[model samples]
Target chain A: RKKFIIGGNWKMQILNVEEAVSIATELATTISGILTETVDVFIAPSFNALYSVGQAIKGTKLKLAGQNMYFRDKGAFTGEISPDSLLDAGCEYVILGHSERRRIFGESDAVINQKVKKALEKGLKPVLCIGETAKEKEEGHTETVLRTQIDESMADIPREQLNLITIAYEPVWAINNKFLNPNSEIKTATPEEAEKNHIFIRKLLINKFGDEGKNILIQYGGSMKASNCEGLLNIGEINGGLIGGASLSAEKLKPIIEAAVKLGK
Target chain B: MRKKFIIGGNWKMQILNVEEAVSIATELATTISGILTETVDVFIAPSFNALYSVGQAIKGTKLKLAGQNMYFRDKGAFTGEISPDSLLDAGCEYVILGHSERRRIFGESDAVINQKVKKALEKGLKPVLCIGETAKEKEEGHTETVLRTQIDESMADIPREQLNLITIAYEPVWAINNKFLNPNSEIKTATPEEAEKNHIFIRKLLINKFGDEGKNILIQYGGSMKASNCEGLLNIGEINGGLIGGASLSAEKLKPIIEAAVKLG
Candidate 1:
């Protein structure tokens, strides 16, 4: 069975290295006792904070990840981070194809595929995110959307390398909808909705990669908080979470990791 | 007189590790110790992963920091994007916007670039707005037309009072000679005459928009600038300085460019 993997995507929060180090230090103290093979924890800080945070979490069970990276190893793609730089910054994983990147920054599936391939080639684990938007959910095209994203984004990957990748199901409508747009009406996904999609995604993975897919971790990322973390992680099909707002504070993030540990036990 | 001539080294997607970044930054600080800040301003933009470490490496020196790119928002769910607030906290006084790589490879439209420029200024970080025409556009004799549209739209609604805080980098895409775009293509650097012509035209548009205040706005030539061409380019009265690329990766290559600017100024 896959270890319960929980990743804190700080997104664009924690502005400076000092504050990032402070939060990472707090997390180091919080998770020191619970560090074990049963659960894997990683934090993705803004690119500017990655190195300092890595230094802060050094020697701890916690790992590092980059929020995003460009497909090429290096070149004149201004503003794009390279996989080599991320690896050098101590990032073992890179979150790619996040809903915000797709909706706001306009990253296409083809572009994401190139990134995934490059990450895998460079030995950086890729946390590939895919899900439906509010309109897609309302129109009942969630499955189709997931199917297309999985097929296109993961296209041409060797079966042997499947284990190194993580799939994150982020219901676009439920991801910080209120924070992004104060007047928006989208609600968070309930455990049942999250589990259903996880199972659907699992089955899709299994169909494509056979048994190797069953071992691939599927993380539910959409406004996941301490209060609801247990409910989401309790489902047999749900592997863990790709946390957002709740992951900003060690106090808020601790309980979620505790819940994962409890369920993993 | 116009503000001190500014030269920025955009280490676009180069450097593999934090150590190398710090080493390069340290060398640059040491080598450019003779840089006359009263005559020329200097900054280097590293990959996001290296920003903090490089910031630490260059402190107390004439060297300053910059982010290669940034998002318009202060913070939130814009994954893989560094916010303007984050850049400021990372010790960036300047942020490059609308580089040819970002515009051509990443599909950054003029509208989005405008939003980023406005947000960077609002957050107290200076904006290095890059504007230029592509090979095809130039071949079709649309260089002036392209420059006018980009300048008018990107600087739209930005108050004339804040124009001083913005540096316009003119990167003619045809002369960039990027490896990713066409490796087989011959190396091409924009001639001093062509760069000066475009700089004059760009200044006219800025003046048309912001009156005499626009004349104070510095325009740096960005296409294939290096030690070999720096003397001639800076000799052009209209060309303030350069936004160096490959030459900026090392102090050995960048020192001559800085020396040329200091002498010319």
Candidate 2:
């Protein structure tokens, strides 16, 4: 009975004003009627495109999210985004602690925790991402890694604030065009496997945060496309997706949107 | 004297809701637009959220917008990081990269910062590259060594033509938060005269690397830059301007700094 959701993480994609405006325009017209009130659709555009995209999606059900944010409302943290700015910029959500941020930028669990607190404090829903590296998975440390990350990131939050966060599990090795046979066979977890990880994450949350954790909106992401999205969302624990590459084009996103709507019913 | 002055206000993670931010920009634009005769290249980097509203307010005025930081790639799977292409699309003509805080807190290396510089230039966005030494480095006599490595790394592979698109700001770590000195303690900070010594050293490296064209590049001093010290800082032949800090919040606080730069003309 929790809210079903789909978030397009337009990660590092080059979206100019015209291109961004056009995509938002098309989605506003085509997807509004098809989407159910039970389903929440959000887009995380590059910082430059947020305003234009927000303007384009105005008066629509679609929501706006920032790709990342700094923990402070404001002060001398140069080159960082603040929570207050995110609110002023029309962001309803923020994606935080993605493995990419953890691995690429050296974002520690502590830094991500600060961002999580700040986002929640400023009225922005935070999608806190957690996952294990291929080696960690291979080494059978997947649950341990997830537990460590979840415990560290949410350590400061009160039990009641758990639902203010959404959880996204995008395993590190399967992301960003990683493939199996090199013929566009994206190295993605099957729906069952992705759901398994989602369940694992949920179990940890429930055990740690008790009844409040059961209400946390959980998502699966790793090459989520039209073909595979339905099965993933149908799982009891997996309620949404933090989609990547396939979400860029309106045409491609349409089928996935339909699948989510159908599942919401 | 064809546009030799450059002043950048790094509103590092400062929060002003939409109205507050827009008001500041509107006030500055109205005041500076009417009074300023000398064309100083001024850029203000608000928190990302404020960029759009601030951009709207600064239009048709001499003020330009800046992104606090950005990724090296134009587009990618890197989460929570903005790229050069996005910064350009967002009305950011300039980007501040490799601040001491980023290096200290986020662990950005000189090599990583170099990649960012190259990427920013490739996308036609100017980069205000920040380089500095911590008080530890200064005490250890590593100031020159630290600055040299950062300059060498960031400037490497950057063509002479692209060099003009770059600005360097020298911020000393110790000087940044030194104003909160205890009554009994003499707070140690680099005077404008002392900062000039560092600026002269930085200018030499530029001249050596890119020849006379390097001399054409502007160097700004940061770290507690205030109206009282703006004149002395600008008095240094190589210190083309200032990367203003705390005083940037209010038009009243910033007006004298602008006045000081004009007086230098």
Candidate 3:
């Protein structure tokens, strides 16, 4: 079985480096005792806080990930971070194709695919995020949307690199207020619904990469919180979570990790 | 009688690691140690992950720091977006907005660029607002039309009092060899005569909008500037300095350009 992975995507929060470092330090110290080899923990700080946060969590179970990165290794793409720079900042993984990037920033499937290939080439784990929106779900196109996103974002990616990628299922409508449509009501996907989607995503992966796809870790991310983490993690198809709001602080993030640790044991 | 000539190296996405970025900054600091800050101002915008470390590396030098981009909001859940507050916290004194790459590749509009400029000013970070026309637009003779719209809209509501905080960078898209946009084409830097004409036009737009106060606003030439062509461009009365690209990555290449600005002063 693959090790369960939980990533805290700080995602444009925490204004100061000192504050980010403090939160990372507290999370590292708070979660020290319960950590196990069966579980992997990482945090994605805003780019400005990456280095300090990485420094704060060093020698601990907590690893660092860049919330995003450019496909290019370097040069002339102003305002974009390269995978090499993320690695230099002590990142072992980089979250690519997040919902915000897709909707707000207009990152296409081809662009995300380029980023994933680049991340892999630069030796950083790529956390590829994909999911459907509220309207798509209401229109009964969840599977179609997921299929297209998965197929296109992973297009041309070698089957051998399957294990190096972590697929995050971030249902857009279920995300928090910041990313949610004002007209749409907020809701979390039930465990059954999440499990069904995870199973479907895994099947797609397996179809593309044979048995190697089954080893790819799939994380549930929309509105994932401490109160609901255990039920979601209990599902066989749900390996772990790509936590958002709940991951901002150690107190909120601890319960989710504890749930994973309990299940891992 | 005039604002000091300020040169900013956008390093864009180069120098893939913190160590490399710091080494470059260290070298730059050493090479320009005799620079008279009274006449010339210099800064480098490194990838976000390298900002803090580079800031420390250039601690007491006359060199300042800038963020290649920033979100309009102070703090939020805009994943992968860096905020103005975070940029300042990371020791950045300026933020580049509306670069051609952002407008062409990422689809950043004048409205969005306006919000970013206002936010940077509100947060006390100088705004390096880049405005330019693409090759096709230039060929169609829409250069002035494009520049007018970009200047009028991007600086729409900015008050005269705050106009000086903004440095307008005129980087004609056709003159830049953007790998994503024109991977195979060889780009030529704009001739000093052509660039000066555009710079004068941009200055006139500013003056028309803000009276004499706009005369003090710095206008930088940013299309493929290098040591070879930099002296000629900087010698133009309307072209204050340069928002350097490829040539800014190394001290050896950047020194001559800096020396040219000093010589002119």
Q: Candidate 3 — which residues are off by over 4 angstroms?
A: A176-188, B178-189
Best by DockQ: 3
Worst 10 residues of 1 chain B by lDDT: B180-189
Indicate whether candidate 1 or candidate 2 has the larger lDDT: 1
Q: How high is the lDDT of residue A144 in model 2?
A: 90
Q: What does candidate 1 score in Cα RMSD to the true structure?
A: 2.6
Q: TM-score order of candidates, best first? A: 3, 1, 2
Report model 1's TM-score to 2 decimal places.
Answer: 0.94
DockQ of each: 0.80, 0.58, 0.83
Candidate 1 runs further than 4 Å off: A175-188, B1-4, B35-37, B178-189
Per-residue lDDT of model 3, residues B1-265, tens digit only: 6436888999888778788888999999888887665789899999888888888888888888999999888777788999888878768898899998889888999999999999988888899999998876777688899999999889888866787798999987877655666455456566878888899999899888888988889998887688778888888899888998878899988888888888888
Question: What 10-residue stretch in candidate 3 chain A is worst by lDDT?
Answer: A175-184
In model 1, the Cα lDDT at residue A166 comes to 97
